[PDB]
Each structure stands twice: as C-alpha cells, then as structure tokens.
Scaffold this active site. Sequence first.
Site, PDB file in Angstrom:
ATOM      1  N   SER A   1       0.774  -1.267   0.000  1.00 46.38           N
ATOM      2  CA  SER A   1       0.000   0.000   0.000  1.00 46.38           C
ATOM      3  C   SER A   1       0.785   1.286   0.000  1.00 46.38           C
ATOM      4  O   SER A   1       0.208   2.368  -0.094  1.00 46.38           O
ATOM      5  CB  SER A   1      -1.019   0.053   1.143  1.00 46.38           C
TER       6      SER A   1
ATOM      7  N   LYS B   1       0.034   3.595  -2.674  1.00 48.20           N
ATOM      8  CA  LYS B   1      -1.068   4.529  -2.582  1.00 48.20           C
ATOM      9  C   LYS B   1      -0.607   5.963  -2.283  1.00 48.20           C
ATOM     10  O   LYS B   1      -1.358   6.904  -2.535  1.00 48.20           O
ATOM     11  CB  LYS B   1      -2.079   4.067  -1.530  1.00 48.20           C
TER      12      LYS B   1
ATOM     13  N   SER C   1      -6.700   2.934   3.112  1.00 48.51           N
ATOM     14  CA  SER C   1      -6.063   2.178   2.009  1.00 48.51           C
ATOM     15  C   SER C   1      -7.076   1.308   1.231  1.00 48.51           C
ATOM     16  O   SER C   1      -6.805   0.132   0.921  1.00 48.51           O
ATOM     17  CB  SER C   1      -4.853   1.354   2.476  1.00 48.51           C
TER      18      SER C   1
HETATM   19  B1  LIG Z   1      -2.099  -2.015   1.493  1.00 52.58           B
HETATM   20  O1  LIG Z   1      -0.723  -2.522   1.930  1.00 52.58           O
HETATM   21  O2  LIG Z   1      -2.996  -1.857   2.736  1.00 52.58           O
HETATM   22  C1  LIG Z   1      -2.780  -3.008   0.432  1.00 52.58           C
HETATM   23  C2  LIG Z   1      -1.985  -3.060  -0.872  1.00 52.58           C
HETATM   24  N1  LIG Z   1      -2.850  -4.352   1.000  1.00 52.58           N
HETATM   25  C3  LIG Z   1      -4.006  -5.021   1.021  1.00 52.58           C
HETATM   26  O3  LIG Z   1      -5.051  -4.527   0.611  1.00 52.58           O
HETATM   27  C4  LIG Z   1      -4.013  -6.395   1.644  1.00 52.58           C
HETATM   28  C5  LIG Z   1      -4.485  -7.440   0.638  1.00 52.58           C
HETATM   29  C6  LIG Z   1      -3.380  -8.205  -0.071  1.00 52.58           C
HETATM   30  C7  LIG Z   1      -4.014  -9.369  -0.839  1.00 52.58           C
HETATM   31  C8  LIG Z   1      -3.658 -10.733  -0.242  1.00 52.58           C
HETATM   32  N2  LIG Z   1      -4.880 -11.344   0.269  1.00 52.58           N
HETATM   33  C9  LIG Z   1      -5.662 -12.285  -0.278  1.00 52.58           C
HETATM   34  O4  LIG Z   1      -6.658 -12.699   0.301  1.00 52.58           O
HETATM   35  O5  LIG Z   1      -5.363 -12.852  -1.591  1.00 52.58           O
HETATM   36  C10 LIG Z   1      -5.714 -12.151  -2.789  1.00 52.58           C
HETATM   37  C11 LIG Z   1      -6.240 -13.085  -3.855  1.00 52.58           C
HETATM   38  C12 LIG Z   1      -5.781 -14.401  -3.942  1.00 52.58           C
HETATM   39  C13 LIG Z   1      -6.276 -15.250  -4.935  1.00 52.58           C
HETATM   40  C14 LIG Z   1      -7.229 -14.785  -5.843  1.00 52.58           C
HETATM   41  C15 LIG Z   1      -7.689 -13.470  -5.757  1.00 52.58           C
HETATM   42  C16 LIG Z   1      -7.191 -12.624  -4.766  1.00 52.58           C
HETATM   43  N3  LIG Z   1      -5.067  -6.373   2.653  1.00 52.58           N
HETATM   44  C17 LIG Z   1      -4.827  -6.035   3.923  1.00 52.58           C
HETATM   45  O6  LIG Z   1      -3.707  -5.736   4.324  1.00 52.58           O
HETATM   46  C18 LIG Z   1      -6.004  -5.997   4.881  1.00 52.58           C
HETATM   47  C19 LIG Z   1      -6.750  -7.322   5.045  1.00 52.58           C
HETATM   48  C20 LIG Z   1      -8.273  -7.149   5.150  1.00 52.58           C
HETATM   49  N4  LIG Z   1      -8.504  -5.921   5.911  1.00 52.58           N
HETATM   50  C21 LIG Z   1      -9.709  -5.414   6.191  1.00 52.58           C
HETATM   51  O7  LIG Z   1      -9.805  -4.377   6.833  1.00 52.58           O
HETATM   52  O8  LIG Z   1     -10.931  -6.102   5.757  1.00 52.58           O
HETATM   53  C22 LIG Z   1     -12.141  -5.468   5.305  1.00 52.58           C
HETATM   54  C23 LIG Z   1     -13.050  -6.554   4.740  1.00 52.58           C
HETATM   55  C24 LIG Z   1     -12.854  -4.759   6.455  1.00 52.58           C
HETATM   56  C25 LIG Z   1     -11.832  -4.461   4.200  1.00 52.58           C
HETATM   57  C26 LIG Z   1      -8.916  -8.383   5.801  1.00 52.58           C
HETATM   58  O9  LIG Z   1      -8.537  -8.751   6.939  1.00 52.58           O
HETATM   59  O10 LIG Z   1      -9.816  -8.983   5.169  1.00 52.58           O
END
Ligand SMILES: *[B]([O])([O])[C]([C])[N]C(=O)[C]([C][C][C][C][N]C(=O)O[C]C1=[C][C]=[C][C]=[C]1)[N]C(=O)[C][C][C]([N]C(=O)OC([C])([C])[C])C([O])=O
Length: 354
Positions: A41, A44, A107
């Site tokens: 992120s 961003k 983010s």
């Molecule tokens: B930045 O660093 O914040 C941003 C670039 N990072 C993120 O958004 C990461 C996600 C990274 C993706 C890896 N996760 C995954 O599940 O695989 C992706 C995939 C695989 C196969 C096919 C398709 C896609 N996210 C986070 O750091 C936060 C996690 C998230 N946080 C959150 O607040 O959740 C809600 C739902 C409230 C938004 C969580 O815990 O679900």
Amino acid sequence: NIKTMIPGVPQIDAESYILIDYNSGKVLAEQNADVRRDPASLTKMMTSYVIGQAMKAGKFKETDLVTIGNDAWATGNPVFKGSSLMFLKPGMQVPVSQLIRGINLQSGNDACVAMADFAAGSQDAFVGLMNSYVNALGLKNTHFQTVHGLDADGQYSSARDMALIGQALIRDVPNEYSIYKEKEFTFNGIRQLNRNGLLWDNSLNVDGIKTGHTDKAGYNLVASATEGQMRLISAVMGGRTFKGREAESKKLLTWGFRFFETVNPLKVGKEFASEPVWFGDSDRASLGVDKDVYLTIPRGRMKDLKASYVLNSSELHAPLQKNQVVGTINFQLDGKTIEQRPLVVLQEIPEGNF
Ligand SMILES: *[B]([O])([O])[C]([C])[N]C(=O)[C]([C][C][C][C][N]C(=O)O[C]C1=[C][C]=[C][C]=[C]1)[N]C(=O)[C][C][C]([N]C(=O)OC([C])([C])[C])C([O])=O
C-alpha cells in the site's frame, strides 16, 4: 570527543530503511535503502500524489461526485479478495473527499480504482501518470503497474524512493498531505479509523504517512513526524514482525530528533555577501541563494556553524542576471565543509546606462 561524536544507529528489525530530513534532504541513517522491494500500500502514496496534483491544478474538487463503475465494485472483482475496501458498488455517487479519505486513511483498493478512472480515464492511463512522476522525481528504483499496490509482478520501489515520495507529497501537495493526520472518517454510516497507529502516539507528533502490508512486502511504513523546526521522514520496508510494525519506525524517528537538528541559516532573496561589479548600473552585486538553505547537523552544534564563500571568476562583469550562479557557499563545522550551496545574484545588474 563529545562535540565530534558520531551516534550509533539502533538495530532495525526490517529488510530496509532510511531516515531523512524533510527540509534538507539529509540522509541520517540507511540500510539497503536502494534495494528493490514489493511496495504494497505504499503505492497509494503515489496514487494520492497524482490525485493531489490533479486537485492542485483544479481538475476536480473535494465536493465533486464520482459515479462508481464496475471495476471499482469491491465484491464484483475477486482481485480484491482479502484487501482493504470501502465496499463501493456500481452506481454509488461518492464525493471525492470521501474517496480520498478511503485511500489515505483506510487504504481502500476499490477507492483507488474509482479515483483512477475519475482522474485519468482508465487504470492504465493513471498508472502512466504515476510512472511519469516517478521520472519527474528522479526516482531510480521504482516502477508501478497498478493503482493500489496489491503485489504485482513487475512493480517495485525502495526505502529511499518511498521516503522521497513522502517528501514530495508533503512539499508539492500539502492540501492532500493534510488529510493523512485525520484519525477517522465515516462512509455509509460506518466509522473508519486511520490505519496509521502512530498518529495516537503521544510521545511524537506523527502526522503521516502510509502503513501497509501484503504477503510479499511484509510490514511497510512511511512515517513523518515533527519537533520544533524539524520534520523527519522514515521509510521501513519488509518489517519482520507484527509487533514491530510501528515500534521500529518509532526507534528511528526518536533517534533522529535526539541526535540531529535542522538549521535554516539563509533564505531566498536575503544578502549573504556583496562583491564589486564592473560595467553595471550599480557598483555592487548582492549575493545569496535562489532556494532556502536547510542543513541537518548534530544536535546542539548550531553555534559552531560557520559560513564562507568562493567565487567562480576573478571579477564580476555586468550584465548580471537574477539568480546567475557566481560562486559557492561553504557551510563548516570544526573546520571542515559539511555542506555547499550555489551563490547567486539576488537583484539583476544590467550594463550601465547614462
Ligand atoms: B495495502 O498494503 O494496505 C494493500 C496493498 N494491502 C491489502 O489490501 C491487503 C491485501 C493483499 C491481498 C492478499 N490477500 C488475499 O486474500 O489474496 C488475494 C487473492 C488471492 C487469490 C485470488 C484473488 C485474490 N489487505 C490487507 O492488508 C487488509 C486485510 C483485510 N482488511 C480489512 O480491513 O478487511 C475489510 C473486509 C474490512 C476491508 C482483511 O482482513 O480482510
């Protein structure tokens, strides 16, 4: 020995880091700062930078409504699985102000898409702008492929480059940067907390910038903080533990302020020196700088700073243009030049007319 001490740097539990002074650009400490890594992120910050530039140029304003398209539909695109998300849906009409807080505070990956299409027509065109500013900013180890920083095969940055992107946000788009200290915003009846935990650390004045994790990146943080005349930026990439995600950066920032200070010994337009001039409408040239001088020195050495100058040519001959370079200013501590800045003509001196 106490005067001339070089402080030992704290151990930092991360793959790379850098600590710089925002005003002078001085690098206070660094490890692996040019190693190319997954930015997560931190990407961003560049998305936000592009949006800030568009706003500064008046292309759109915080109250303008953005109509959400299919590509920003959080649950319509499995690429967003497990990511930070506003849960935008197609047809929503969301103020820019809300989307940029979704990006900056939360983010939101979906908000990034929505703003990219709004600002630039397509994600690809927006990524072109991102990379254009990578070039403009002289960054040597950064390349973006998408608007949100999800791990992408050919995307990378470095601790130095992310610190410089932070510096650029603060310097060039201050109205955008002012958003980053906001502790919360509300969207669709739900309060959302700024993910930068250091904003709540009473011991520092942290007011940015971006925390982020992906599986390939580990824990990443670009932080900026102030103390009096002084603003530091830290970038720590590939932080190894959850428990060190704020603490390691706090170590760097705290060390920075304890051992260093920023001095501003000269401002643009103020006379540092005078020299005679030949053939002019004036007999003397007023000399100084075309950019405010900021230096970072060991803390408490301000009274020991000395300044002097050298001239490029034996004589100054009119016409002298405003900001014409005529020499160099040497700033010195314990007899050794520590910093040099161009010595320039402050007020034009055309050839005499009588
Ligand atoms: B930045 O660093 O914040 C941003 C670039 N990072 C993120 O958004 C990461 C996600 C990274 C993706 C890896 N996760 C995954 O599940 O695989 C992706 C995939 C695989 C196969 C096919 C398709 C896609 N996210 C986070 O750091 C936060 C996690 C998230 N946080 C959150 O607040 O959740 C809600 C739902 C409230 C938004 C969580 O815990 O679900």
